């Protein structure tokens, strides 16, 4: 079952705002919006979802994960977003 990741778990963030990735008009293209790792057992954004909580009751896991992004902006506002998945062992890309 789909469950919200806390990708905005950085500091100086209140309760509800920690679940939201902030996108703005005053951000250039080819720029990074947000990044988070995929492994749910290790602490981080997946510490908030349900699959990252159930998998902490086990030791090992193996399968395909599904990640969903849902946009909450004005119906009159559009844009584009590149969602890239970096395979394990590769460092975080520095360029789009």
């Amino acid at each position: 079952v789909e469950t919200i990741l806390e990708v905005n778990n950085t500091t100086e963030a209140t309760g509800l705002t920690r679940l939201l990735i902030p996108v703005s008009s005053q951000n250039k293209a080819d720029e990074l919006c947000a990044a988070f790792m995929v492994d749910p057992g290790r602490i981080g954004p997946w510490q908030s979802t349900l699959v990252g909580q159930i998998c902490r009751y086990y030791t090992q896991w193996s399968g395909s994960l599904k990640v969903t992004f849902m946009f909450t902006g004005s119906f009159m506002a559009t844009g584009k977003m590149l969602v890239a998945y970096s395979p394990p062992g590769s460092a975080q890309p520095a360029n789009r």
Binding site: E6, V7, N8, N9, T10, T11, G15, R18, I21, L32, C33, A34, A35, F36, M37, I43, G44, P45, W46, Q47, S48, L50, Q53, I54, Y57, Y58, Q92
Partner: protein, 207 residues
């Protein structure tokens, strides 16, 4: 395909209580509850309705550890039945309260309490009035311990109860708790709120 089932998810014995005898009080009671310890409370509260049979094992020991062959009585008091008040009180001899007589040197006593709620399933989230919202539908009984003897000895004891669930079914899953527990009521701290995820440097750093 077997380690993820509810039956396997819940079937593992574990400490659910600590009981101390003194035999100067002489006896010691322990009301059966799952939410005594945080680790197992966090697991059963993940669901709404559960239906299972509980197996209780009593690993009793002396203060030092050595076990003289003293005789023990573990009495199960189902809900509704009055609990023993003294070492020599008349509720110990009641035939309708099941009892187990074991020695200190004997292996631990093990009994099986079936699903015997008035309803068709247990529930630890009751929304309404009978935080409050406590349901008498899940009491599961009581356990009482004493040493049987025509004279009150001076033995000091400490009992450990291990409970194991089987034939367990669950309905209506719900989120696992993240706030620290404050024993029956899901009270939390308004000010001290622990974010479910640890803080990192910035949203643009994967690590």
């Amino acid at each position: 395909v077997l380690e993820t089932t509810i039956n396997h998810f819940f079937s593992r014995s574990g400490l659910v209580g600590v009981v101390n005898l003194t035999d100067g009080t002489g006896y010691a009671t322990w009301d059966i509850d799952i939410m005594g310890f945080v680790q197992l409370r966090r697991k059963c509260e993940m669901f709404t309705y559960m239906r299972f049979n509980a197996e209780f094992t009593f690993v009793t020991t002396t203060k030092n550890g050595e076990a003289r062959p003293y005789m023990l009585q573990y009495m199960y008091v189902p809900p509704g039945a009055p609990k023993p008040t003294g070492r020599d009180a008349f509720q110990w001899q009641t035939a309708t309260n099941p009892s187990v007589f074991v020695k200190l040197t004997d292996p631990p006593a093990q009994v099986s309490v079936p699903f015997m709620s008035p309803a068709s399933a247990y529930q630890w989230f009751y929304d309404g009035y009978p935080t409050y919202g406590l349901c008498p539908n899940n009491m599961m009984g009581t356990f009482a311990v004493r040493v049987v003897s025509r004279e009150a000895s001076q033995l000091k004891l400490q009992t450990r109860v291990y409970m194991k669930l089987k034939h367990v079914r669950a309905w209506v899953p719900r989120p696992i708790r993240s706030q620290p527990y404050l024993k029956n009521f899901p009270n939390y701290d308004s000010s001290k709120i622990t974010n479910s995820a640890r803080d990192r440097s910035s949203i643009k750093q994967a690590n």
